Design a protein around this ligand. Structure first.
Ligand SMILES: CCCCCCCC/C=C/CCCCCCCC(=O)O[C@@H](COC(=O)CCCCCCCCCCCCCCC)COP(=O)([O-])OCC[N+](C)(C)C
Ligand SMILES: CCCCCCCC/C=C\CCCCCCCC(=O)O[C@@H](COC(=O)CCCCCCCCCCCCCCC)COP(=O)([O-])OCC[N+](C)(C)C
Ligand SMILES: CC(=O)[C@H]1CC[C@H]2[C@@H]3CC=C4C[C@@H](OS(=O)(=O)O)CC[C@]4(C)[C@H]3CC[C@]12C
Ligand SMILES: CC(=O)[C@H]1CC[C@H]2[C@@H]3CC=C4C[C@@H](OS(=O)(=O)O)CC[C@]4(C)[C@H]3CC[C@]12C
Lengths: 46, 98, 91, 182, 281, 49, 51
């Protein structure tokens, strides 16, 4: 829309976005990952 | 299918299971032992096993008699190409059945 | 395992007179180690972590049961001492 | 096995350093251990035998007698711990994992695998184009019968045999040097 | 040997040892009808030896009550030693390794001669690794010239023989070679650490109309999921699946127990010295 | 044996995990609205569930 | 030191030395008991480690 002249952000290079804007060479190589929720249980000597 | 040589009498050596049940055997008539390539003969062997016991059950419950022989090729069956005639033909037991 | 391994880029419009020199200044900064500087100072911190197996040392919450038996064998002892004299007093 | 040769020496030599020190540290003290009694004390603590009736007398020697008792505990404890690690962490493995194994998918000349010629296995690999590389490797090594191929793996001439599970699982049970994988 | 029994457990055993010693010699042995006098010196010695796999000569108390207290302490000591050994085995069975070399900025790679016997690292020339190393590490490049390798396969075998101890090359190739390696004995440092991070690209003639068409096609493969299928079909490996291996217990591993012993040699002198100063006055 | 075999399990192995491969109402997983993650899942038909 | 006292001593050593025994008064007999103590230490360590 002309509001911004550059997007300096973690913008993922995609086929969808590449049809409209010019991505640079990646400054960070990465991928998609799944984040999930994370000692000793010796009750006693018996 | 266990294939074992027959005794000099030509019958099948009598063996029993672990329990003591008699092992049913069938006189096969397959190719000569150690392949039939050079010694081309059909020596009657002795056949027994899972498929022979099932065959004996099939014959009893469907009332047909049978003559068991081993496949001459030694193969199971595959449509090998004959480049000589631009065709295909089966071998093994598949060729014998067809 | 990682999937959709697409990186991060700088977005500019289709014309982008800066498109070529931005990319050339990003490949240059990888080779110079400038981006490894940024990864060190912003990405590699490692506040706390653990391994999958991670054998754990035995703390007092684990060994308190047997430490409360030697303590219980003292209060039992200071009782049993009175029986010892009292038994010996008779004979 | 759990200890290195030089760790056996250092343990044995530290017995005598303690034994000689315990003698000096007890003899030259204000108000005991002979040299022979100090050697028995040090070996008795390490070997956990009751041999020897002498114990350090001076305050300074008893501290070293106390620590030597703890040192000898760890040496025996870490022998039992390292022996247990050695006996649990004995996993040769490195065994084929099914048909999608990278060794089968991208075979080398060292690894040889085959099936029986002109059977359902042959026309399974031949039918699928994604298995074309595996077919060529087996094409030159295919066997006439399964008894030969099973004998080949026993004699190390063949490394993997692909066949019917109903037949292979019978040979794995009857013959103790064969296992089915994947 | 420091790993089981957090230092609070060891400390509490010592102060429970002093508690049990004082009670057994001042309340259980003094007050007993029966009871060579059992003192603090030979109560600390008795209870200490019991904890450490009772093997020292001792003097047991004669009182019936103090014999019960030593017996309930002997039960603690068998649990203490059973739970020390059991956890020490658990540690040894479940330790991972620490790679000896950190990265391309390590001491060995920076100055190998000034370090221990020289570190032998090299690379295949005429590529981009040299161009990255000529420009960045000039001193590294000069020392690397004498250890050049004609190809990747040559440097793989030189590592096994021992002519080289580190091969510096492209990450994607090294990941593959470290993947389908027999015995899984060649690994890449940092668990796959990558320096001068870049990628493989299709080179097209400068100022051409096909760059946009190729770029969008490659990005489609990532979105449509072909890249992960290709990665599993080509770049997968045996050694990528997983470790922990049994190791001996050389002095370098056991230096800690000897320093503790060697320090008790040091502590014994100080008290031995302090005796003479206290004996003089 | 107790101190060695202490190991939790049942961790998601990726998008191919059977927990994720089909939508089970007990499990709740989500991403950020209007991002590259969204236009990755919606573009691919195979993982439309 | 009888043969029945040597069996009791050697048996106790090989089973986590814990019984009242009578040690020999010689020296080369003391060396032998110490050699047996080393075997007894290794024997029990291997029994526990493999168990
Ligand atoms: C439980 C925890 C420990 C607690 C107790 C610690 C006790 C500390 C004791 C330490 C004593 C010193 C260690 C000696 C090392 C011998 C090396 C050697 O050549 O071994 C040989 C074998 O040898 C044997 O089988 C044993 C030989 C022992 C001889 C007696 C030594 C003196 C005893 C004491 C007199 C004073 C000693 C003073 C020493 C200065 C060969 O080694 P290998 O071939 O690699 O292995 C053989 C197996 N293989 C052929 C199948 C491969
Ligand atoms: C290394 C082996 C060699 C040495 C072997 C030595 C031989 C042993 C000889 C003899 C033992 C004879 C049997 C009595 C033992 C208790 C059994 C019981 O039912 O207790 C119950 C109550 O216990 C407790 O909860 C308290 C125990 C700890 C505190 C101390 C109090 C006094 C208990 C002892 C008094 C002294 C008795 C003295 C006279 C005999 C168990 O409670 P729980 O909740 O069911 O516990 C389950 C375990 N869990 C929590 C881990 C899941
Ligand atoms: C007989 C001795 O003299 C030895 C025998 C075993 C030794 C202990 C082993 C482990 C630890 C844990 C360590 O703290 S930690 O945070 O590193 O766990 C502090 C030191 C401490 C208590 C040692 C003290 C000295 C010993 C009692
Ligand atoms: C009374 C004594 O003489 C003992 C009691 C507590 C002992 C200390 C306990 C813990 C450690 C850590 C260890 O660290 S290491 O990285 O070198 O393994 C080195 C040895 C050291 C300092 C011991 C020295 C000896 C003691 C002072």
């Amino acid at each position: 829309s002309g509001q911004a002249d550059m997007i300096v952000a973690p913008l993922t290079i995609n086929n969808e976005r590449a049809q409209y804007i010019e991505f640079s060479k990646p400054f960070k190589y990465q991928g998609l990952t799944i984040l999930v929720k994370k000692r000793s249980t010796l009750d006693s000597f018996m | 299918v266990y294939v074992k040589p027959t005794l000099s009498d030509g019958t099948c050596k009598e063996e029993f299971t672990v329990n003591g049940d008699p092992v049913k055997k069938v006189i096969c008539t397959g190719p000569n032992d150690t392949s039939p390539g050079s010694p081309r003969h059909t020596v009657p062997q002795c056949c027994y096993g899972f498929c022979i016991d099932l065959l004996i059950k099939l014959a009893r419950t469907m009332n047909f008699t049978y003559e068991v022989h081993l496949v001459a090729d030694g193969k199971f069956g595959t449509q090998e190409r004959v480049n000589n005639s631009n065709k295909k033909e089966w071998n093994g037991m598949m060729g014998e059945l067809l | 395992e990682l999937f959709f391994r697409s990186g991060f880029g700088i977005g500019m419009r289709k014309d982008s007179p800066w498109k070529q020199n931005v990319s050339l200044s990003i490949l240059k900064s990888h080779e110079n180690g400038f981006m490894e500087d940024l990864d060190k100072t912003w990405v590699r911190y490692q506040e706390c972590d653990s391994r999958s197996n991670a054998p754990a040392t035995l703390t007092f919450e684990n060994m308190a049961g047997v430490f409360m038996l030697v303590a219980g064998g003292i209060v039992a002892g200071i009782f049993l001492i009175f029986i010892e004299i009292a038994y010996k007093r008779h004979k | 096995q759990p200890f290195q040769s030089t760790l056996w020496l250092l343990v044995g030599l530290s017995v005598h350093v303690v034994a000689v020190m315990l003698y000096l540290l007890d003899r030259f003290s204000p108000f005991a251990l002979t040299l022979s009694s100090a050697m028995w004390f040090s070996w008795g603590v390490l070997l956990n035998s009751g041999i020897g009736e002498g114990a350090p007398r001076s305050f300074s020697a008893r501290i070293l007698g106390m620590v030597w008792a703890g040192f000898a505990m760890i040496i025996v404890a870490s022998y039992t711990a390292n022996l247990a690690a050695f006996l649990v962490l004995d996993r040769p493995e490195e065994r084929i994992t099914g048909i999608n194994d990278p060794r089968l998918r991208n075979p080398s000349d060292k690894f040889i695998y085959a099936t029986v010629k002109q059977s359902s296995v042959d026309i399974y690999f031949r039918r699928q184009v994604e298995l074309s590389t595996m077919y060529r490797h087996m094409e030159k090594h295919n066997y006439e019968s399964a008894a030969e191929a099973i004998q080949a793996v026993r004699d190390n001439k063949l490394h993997a045999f692909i066949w019917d599970s109903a037949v292979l699982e019978f040979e794995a049970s009857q013959k103790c040097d064969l296992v089915t994988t994947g | 040997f420091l790993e089981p029994f957090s230092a609070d457990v060891w400390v509490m055993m010592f102060v429970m040892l002093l508690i049990v010693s004082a009670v057994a010699v001042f309340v259980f042995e003094y007050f007993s009808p029966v009871g060579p006098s059992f003192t603090i010196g030979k109560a600390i010695w008795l209870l200490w030896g019991l904890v450490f796999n009772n093997s020292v000569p001792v003097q047991n108390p004669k009182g019936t009550t103090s014999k019960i207290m030593v017996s309930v302490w002997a039960f603690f000591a068998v649990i203490f030693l059973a739970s020390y050994t059991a956890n020490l085995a658990a540690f040894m069975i479940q330790e991972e390794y620490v790679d000896q070399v950190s990265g391309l900025s390590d001491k060995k790679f920076q100055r190998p001669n000034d370090f221990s016997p020289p570190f032998r690292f090299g690379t295949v020339p005429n590529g981009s690794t040299e161009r990255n190393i000529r420009n960045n590490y000039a001193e590294m490049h000069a020392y690397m010239g004498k250890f050049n390798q004609r190809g990747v396969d040559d440097a793989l075998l030189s590592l096994k023989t021992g002519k080289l101890d580190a091969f510096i090359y492209d990450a994607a190739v090294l990941n593959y070679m470290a993947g389908r390696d027999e015995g899984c004995k060649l690994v890449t440092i940092g668990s796959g650490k990558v320096f001068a991070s870049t990628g493989y690209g299709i080179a097209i003639q400068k100022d051409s109309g096909w760059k946009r068409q190729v770029d969008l096609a490659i990005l489609q493969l990532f979105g449509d999921g072909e890249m992960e299928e290709l990665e599993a079909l080509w770049l997968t490996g045996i050694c990528h699946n997983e470790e922990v291996m049994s190791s001996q217990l050389d002095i370098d591993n056991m230096a800690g127990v000897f320093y503790m012993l060697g320090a008790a040699m040091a502590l014994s002198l100080i008290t031995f010295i302090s005796e003479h100063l206290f004996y003089w006055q």
